[PDB]
């Protein structure tokens, strides 16, 4: 194609992205930055403030999922992994809206999400982070980087990579419009392990890449290399996920008490 159709694609995708993902990057940035009206996240920066915070958010999950009885490094990890599960569900509903996705072989639909969801989650996490911490509870609280950096032993070394990633990624100044298509392009990757019919996936992705190229031209006319930088980010995100999987599977042997939601167990099962 062809301008009006690539623009109607970009628009379809943004409209779905807003229906699928509760806290947009625009609203997260408004929060992190100061503004809105609608005024000002609770901060977690020590044990006392963590416990004050947990009392604001606990109604959110049924009683067992609070894991009261676990040391805090593990509750925080359990809380992220459960928020990640909620992410997979939003991404799945997002993916279903990508023209052509639901007409793919169902087994391929599963493979695209299996291999896609972690890279997407890293991209979403970046919209919630600045140099100083991370928005939590759908933007209602803010956990400082230093607090997370002070968790015991294994855990306290492991957020800092998320932070350095986000800082470089957020320096691209992508808007939700850009992110909607960037995300759709990651999902429709034709080179995931075990795909049955690669061609119809590449064919959709080709349309998506043309919509993304047009979107960045229009929305970032002052950055001619931005498309290329974004494709490079997709490679970075693969390598980051690789690292993460390999780490999980060496840490989890030490950290009895660490448990994966079964949705994530199926995801990690043959995942590289």
């Amino acid at each position: 194609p062809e301008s009006a159709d690539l623009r109607a694609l970009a628009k379809h995708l943004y409209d779905s992205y807003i229906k699928s993902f509760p806290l947009t990057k625009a609203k997260a940035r408004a929060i992190l930055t100061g503004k809105t009206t609608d005024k000002s996240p609770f901060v977690i920066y020590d044990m006392n403030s963590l416990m004050m915070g947990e009392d604001k958010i606990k109604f959110k999950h049924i009683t067992p999922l609070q894991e009261q009885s676990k040391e805090v490094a593990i509750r925080i990890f359990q809380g992220c992994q459960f928020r990640s599960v909620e992410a997979v569900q939003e991404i799945t509903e997002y993916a279903k809206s990508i023209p052509g996705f639901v007409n793919l072989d169902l087994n391929d639909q599963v493979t695209l999400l299996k291999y896609g969801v972690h890279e997407i989650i890293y991209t979403m996490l970046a919209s919630l982070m600045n140099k100083d911490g991370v928005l939590i509870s759908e933007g209602q609280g803010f956990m400082t980087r230093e607090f997370l950096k002070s968790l015991r032993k294994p855990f306290g070394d492991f957020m800092e990579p998320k932070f350095e990633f986000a800082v470089k990624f957020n320096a691209l100044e992508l808007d939700d419009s850009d992110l909607a298509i960037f995300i759709a392009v990651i999902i429709l990757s034709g080179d995931r392990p075990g795909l049955l019919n690669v061609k119809p996936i590449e064919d959709i992705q080709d349309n998506l890449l043309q919509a993304l190229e047009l979107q960045l031209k229009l929305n970032h006319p002052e950055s001619s290399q931005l498309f290329a930088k974004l494709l490079q980010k997709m490679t970075d995100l693969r390598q980051i996920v690789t690292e993460h999987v390999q780490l999980l599977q060496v840490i989890k042997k030490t950290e009895t008490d660490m448990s994966l939601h079964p949705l994530l167990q199926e995801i990690y099962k043959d995942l590289y």
Binding site: V88, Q89, T92, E93, K96, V102, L106, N107, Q109, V110, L113, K114, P262, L263, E266, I267, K269
Partner: peptide
């Protein structure tokens, strides 16, 4: 269906309820 029972159910036409 797999193997990826949950994911397969999420992929069902529908919409969470």
């Amino acid at each position: 269906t797999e193997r990826h029972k949950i994911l397969h159910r999420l992929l069902q036409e529908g919409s969470p309820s």
